[PDB]
């Protein structure tokens, strides 16, 4: 019933797309496909600002109305493809993540540099 | 007081930054700086979806639920720097443009190709 998407890019080879879906006020399903990553674990976070004026550093700190979506795993080919179900990622209401940012980190979830990021935007239901 | 920003990019030479500011429920101040434009008038619109998975076409239609910000003017050097005031751009509430898209068009306000676009995101202050 509510959907969002983020296109991730940064000052690196890392690119991808994340789709988010939430039915009513239930859990948010997050579909991740990110390429160009070093094989292994990468922290995956919601950060507070949908601001990329200064690259991924403009996105501020992790979002804490919560912001930690855990690790995503890149395979030998640099691809991280996974579906997550996270209950703390509203698409509506006071704590909505719409207009905030998703960031993929260089190192495993505590972090390292912010490899890529994208603003969370509304998308057709 | 709420603020938003959009970084605009597209399949073209056009890029820039737009900030939006709103106090209580009143008029929204829009600060524009876009470069790489052909000199003259360019349609400047709010579109429905902050979805750039298919470039600027995936932002959908111009959004009203208002979405027509009029023209911006690119100077001899392709720079359009202007401050607009618009009372149809909520940054809060049911009609928030947060998570939607700003689009700059090839031609004067209908508007030809979508030269550049960006997702409207939250930013400090
Ligand atoms: Zn982080
Ligand atoms: Zn338009």
From Swiss-Prot, chains A, B:
<keyword id="KW-0560">Oxidoreductase</keyword>
<feature type="binding site">
    <location>
        <position position="62"/>
    </location>
    <ligand>
        <name>Zn(2+)</name>
    </ligand>
</feature>
<keyword id="KW-0186">Copper</keyword>
<keyword id="KW-0049">Antioxidant</keyword>
<feature type="binding site">
    <location>
        <position position="47"/>
    </location>
    <ligand>
        <name>Cu cation</name>
    </ligand>
</feature>
<feature type="binding site">
    <location>
        <position position="45"/>
    </location>
    <ligand>
        <name>Cu cation</name>
    </ligand>
</feature>
<keyword id="KW-0809">Transit peptide</keyword>
<keyword id="KW-0862">Zinc</keyword>
<comment type="similarity">
    <text>Belongs to the Cu-Zn superoxide dismutase family.</text>
</comment>
<feature type="disulfide bond">
    <location>
        <begin position="56"/>
        <end position="117"/>
    </location>
</feature>
<keyword id="KW-0150">Chloroplast</keyword>
<keyword id="KW-0479">Metal-binding</keyword>
<feature type="binding site">
    <location>
        <position position="105"/>
    </location>
    <ligand>
        <name>Cu cation</name>
    </ligand>
</feature>
<feature type="binding site">
    <location>
        <position position="68"/>
    </location>
    <ligand>
        <name>Zn(2+)</name>
    </ligand>
</feature>
<dbReference type="GO" id="GO:0019430">
    <property type="term" value="P:removal of superoxide radicals"/>
</dbReference>
<keyword id="KW-1015">Disulfide bond</keyword>
<dbReference type="GO" id="GO:0004784">
    <property type="term" value="F:superoxide dismutase activity"/>
</dbReference>
<comment type="function">
    <text>Destroys radicals which are normally produced within the cells and which are toxic to biological systems.</text>
</comment>
<comment type="subunit">
    <text>Homotetramer.</text>
</comment>
<dbReference type="GO" id="GO:0005507">
    <property type="term" value="F:copper ion binding"/>
</dbReference>
<protein>
    <recommendedName>
        <fullName>Superoxide dismutase [Cu-Zn], chloroplastic</fullName>
        <ecNumber>1.15.1.1</ecNumber>
    </recommendedName>
</protein>
<keyword id="KW-0934">Plastid</keyword>
<feature type="binding site">
    <location>
        <position position="62"/>
    </location>
    <ligand>
        <name>Cu cation</name>
    </ligand>
</feature>
<dbReference type="GO" id="GO:0009507">
    <property type="term" value="C:chloroplast"/>
</dbReference>
């Amino acid at each position: 019933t509510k959907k969002a998407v983020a296109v991730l890019k940064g000052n690196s080879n890392v690119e991808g797309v994340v789709t988010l879906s939430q039915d009513d006020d239930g859990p948010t399903t997050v579909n991740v496909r990110i390429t160009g990553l070093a094989p292994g674990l990468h922290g995956f976070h919601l950060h507070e600002y949908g601001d990329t004026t200064n690259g991924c550093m403009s996105t501020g700190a992790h979002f804490n109305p919560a912001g930690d979506l855990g690790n995503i795993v890149a395979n030998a080919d640099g691809v991280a493809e996974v579906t997550l179900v996270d209950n703390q990622i509203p698409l509506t209401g006071p704590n909505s993540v719409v207009g905030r940012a998703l960031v993929v980190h260089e190192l495993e979830d505590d972090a390292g540099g912010r490899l890529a990021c994208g603003v969370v935007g509304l998308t057709p239901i």
